[PDB]
Amino acid sequence: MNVSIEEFTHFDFQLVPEPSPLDLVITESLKNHIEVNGVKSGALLPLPFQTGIGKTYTALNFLLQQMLEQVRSELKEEKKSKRLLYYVTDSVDNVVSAKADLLKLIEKQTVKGEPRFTLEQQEYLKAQIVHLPNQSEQLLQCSDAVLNDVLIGFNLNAERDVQAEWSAISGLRRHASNPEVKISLNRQAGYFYRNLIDRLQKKQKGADRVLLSGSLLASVETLLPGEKIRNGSAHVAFLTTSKFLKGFHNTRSRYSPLRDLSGAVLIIDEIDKQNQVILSELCKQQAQDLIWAIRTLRANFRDHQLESSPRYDKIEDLFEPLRERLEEFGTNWNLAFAFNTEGANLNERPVRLFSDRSFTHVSSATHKLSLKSDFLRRKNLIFSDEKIEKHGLLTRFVNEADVIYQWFLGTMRKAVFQYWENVRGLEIENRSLEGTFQEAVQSLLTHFNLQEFESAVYESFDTRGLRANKLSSSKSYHHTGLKLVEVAHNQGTRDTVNCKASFLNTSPSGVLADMVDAGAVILGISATARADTVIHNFDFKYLNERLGNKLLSLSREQKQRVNNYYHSRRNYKDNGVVLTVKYLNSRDAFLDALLEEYKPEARSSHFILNHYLGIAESEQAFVRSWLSKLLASIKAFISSPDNRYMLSLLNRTLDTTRQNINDFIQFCCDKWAKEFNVKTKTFFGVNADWMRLVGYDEISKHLNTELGKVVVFSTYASMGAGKNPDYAVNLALEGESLISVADVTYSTQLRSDIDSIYLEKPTQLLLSDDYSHTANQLCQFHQILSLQENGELSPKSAENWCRQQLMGMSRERSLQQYHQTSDYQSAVRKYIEQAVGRAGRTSLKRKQILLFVDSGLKEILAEESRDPSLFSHEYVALVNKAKSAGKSIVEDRAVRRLFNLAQRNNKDGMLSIKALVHRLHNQPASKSDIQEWQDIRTQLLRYPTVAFQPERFNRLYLQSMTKGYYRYQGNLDGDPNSFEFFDRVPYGDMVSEEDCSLATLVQNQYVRPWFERKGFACSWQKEANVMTPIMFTNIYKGALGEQAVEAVLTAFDFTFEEVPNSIYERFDNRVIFAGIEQPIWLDSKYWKHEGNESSEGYSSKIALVEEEFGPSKFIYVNALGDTSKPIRYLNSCFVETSPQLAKVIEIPALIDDSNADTNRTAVQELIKWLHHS
DNA sequence: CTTTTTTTTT
């Protein structure tokens, strides 16, 4: 019988425990956030304080306060749904330890000497918390009575194979032998759980819906903990990040928490380590054949229609542009035919193409691959011509098909949300977006006959249940992604190819920002929450720019209060605590004697390693160093009399697979144990599985009931963060070496932490993915593009690394390339600081603490430069000891990031401008493309220099060391990867206001009123965000010349009309004067300089204009120049001729560059020329 | 030249 909430009626909710400074840090920031933003808006609050200061105890006390607030709210409401609280972390052990810590807090919390909650209140509060493990673990913890009750209650017993499967599972349960049986039991438990829940859900969705209550309800709630969430019995969930990204099950469907994040509270512990976890999920997506997908979309969108019912209101207007695009794409690329390759170098190896989707494009083909349609053969052939043919490239087709596919998935998201709006105002049970999502997708795909995209629609919603590439939007790798396309022959046939494409549509930082934008309030708890790496942490410069004030910050008063709290509870210096740090090299001569004593019947230790320990010849140069620093640390710890607890953090786990090595290590320990008269217990293979099966409490039990030393062998992946290695202290076994460092004792029990640590250098710091080859390729390209996006890599180095990655470089060559970045050193120092923070859990410390660190870490630790006010005592001592050698000359990270980000922004601008011009030079043009081109021109004219970091045209500007001007070198029509900027080029072209001659131009009497009326800037602000060289040379000066010419001509009574999109961008604008039947076009330039306007180009422009518009006149005028030069008259072939026959009039200048005086003579000549037509 | 373990569904 459930506990009623009416037991909290007499509870006094206004009596609360004393809030610590950490509690005030969370509460004041969240209350202020609600004051500033809305009540429904999301937030992200990182809490980057010292390790061991008590940030999980504070997160669980904040969760308990949220549960009490919810109980109070529903007590007064005596309908509002429960607000969901999530506790997420990477490791299962930290999930179960935090749940047991919250339950312990509920059990034995005290207020003024009396328990805060009665036993019935405690049982209700505990009933509000659930834990959601993997499906095999969920099934294996259900007793036979529960599962037989579930099978009986759903009439699932008599269904053939299901009972056959269940009878097998219970059999394996009864005789659970050594782990050999257990791996099989786990695999079959997970498969049976999936099948059973699938049939339970299909039974609950149909008309034969079973009524759940009493025993049946308690059993199904035991089998399905998410059924408690769906009912409303519980609203607190403890789970991992993988489970949170996958979702859980109830009796109806699978609940995805990412689709229902509005109003939720997420507590993410060790948030930085979740960056890689989310990444490993994004790389699991399934590849899609783009040729089949686009041919299916074209075939089914041709005629199929939606219903004209109210529930499908204004959904077809979402899909009409996609239908027009599909019909145009299929006409252009001849999608009636299939695709095949031909020629050499195309059959031996498949073709691989990589695209950033903005400006990084790498092809595995030596020559550019073309695409031609053979109407006699009825085939599309991927040729390699041995002779730029812009029309008919394979990369153009692949990019346009990826654009169309992502357009279809985006319009599916838009139409599902529109369906849910139509339903909520029509259907008038689950009336939310998450509950209507499956029916909306099913109805739309069934109506369009596109049910084969159903899985694709679901996963795209899974990745993008929280939600462009235009130089007018904010651009970033984190919301666009990357794409990897493989073109290979179809499996089974020898005459067709397919384009399997794998996409990353967002980065982990984009997912986190989408989560905050959806309305979630997220508490990010980690000491390394603000590490300066983008591989082992989120990009917080991107998150700061995107979230704005939703990224809650902590004032210096609050940080000083937290620092005072930490230094008050960790007073090492006043209490006589001394910690010694040793940087241990490789002592081969010391390992030679120990190896000789181990097996004294052999002469050469090479034979001992090669035969007994099982180490080959490729090793024995590496193993002899990590099995020598480890032994020197263990010997130095055993020689220490007072120290009792040692932890050794390596990169590899010492388990049965390395049993022979353990035999050597155990022998060495026993040799030392008898020499110094101490008892030593060694714990090997302490990994996640050992923690689930055996449990870390055994180590603590050993330290509590037995005297002697203990050495533990774990890794960074198991004990690096979150783990709370503690043991109960009995003064009889601890001697007299323990002392309290807190000024005021704050602990009920007596506990101590590790007193000796050995820290290896972390090794495999570039992330990898063993799921498949495609997943590892996506993870490597994501890490290269994140390093290019941050600024740690120049665009040419990232392009070269992406080319070597497409060519198939080795993991050791990726690791070599990553070791040259400062990201690697910030990741190394983040891992070291987190690992060293495992020895600072309690206030009962040994008088001496021994730290033994790999000597191959000293130079890295020597380059710490952050504020030491946030470090812990062990990390401050590690840094001070490594720094004791002094300071080494290093390059400032900000100056190199500025050089890289200037190169990046300039290359992005060049590629985007070229693609914009290509789209403009296409018949017919587009309204959006013209609008975007105009928006760029007006923005650069109005704001040629901005003060704050731009949020819409961020790629038009670079940040310079000078103010309002900078120097550069590079060919504007050459390689974007060869540009140099700032101080690297002391002599080079300048991007400055005076170089543009703006002041001389505006001195004209007609320029100022036109500029001021239009709002354009007449001067350059002195700010550090200046235009890139491409924007300055190509776009800004052209618009400035065109605007000056139009201003003076309009002052001379010239009316202007918009150029039609058929011939857009080919000429500046129209010309109408006094009324002439013949059309007149105008082309305007800023100054004379050099112009790629040879006779062939002019003839092409005239032919393309006169073809669709007949004969016409043409004016070609330079805005600035010498008025002494004579006005010219040239024919259509740019040849001097008589005025009576010439079709083109040329004006050398319209505004003088010496006094800014208008050319009245030129206007009079133009008047006479026009009147003489 | 570098030198792995971790969660989940399948």
Ligand SMILES: Nc1ncnc2c1ncn2[C@@H]1O[C@H](COP(=O)(O)OP(=O)(O)OP(O)(O)=S)[C@@H](O)[C@H]1O
């Ligand atoms: N004010 C407090 N009262 C009682 N116990 C506390 C208090 N603060 C912390 N503790 C306990 O002391 C230890 C501090 O550990 P946590 O609170 O887990 O540390 P942390 O600061 O979160 O460090 P992390 O998670 O490794 S980076 C835990 O065992 C807490 O349960």
Ligand SMILES: [Mg+2]
């Ligand atoms: Mg924690």
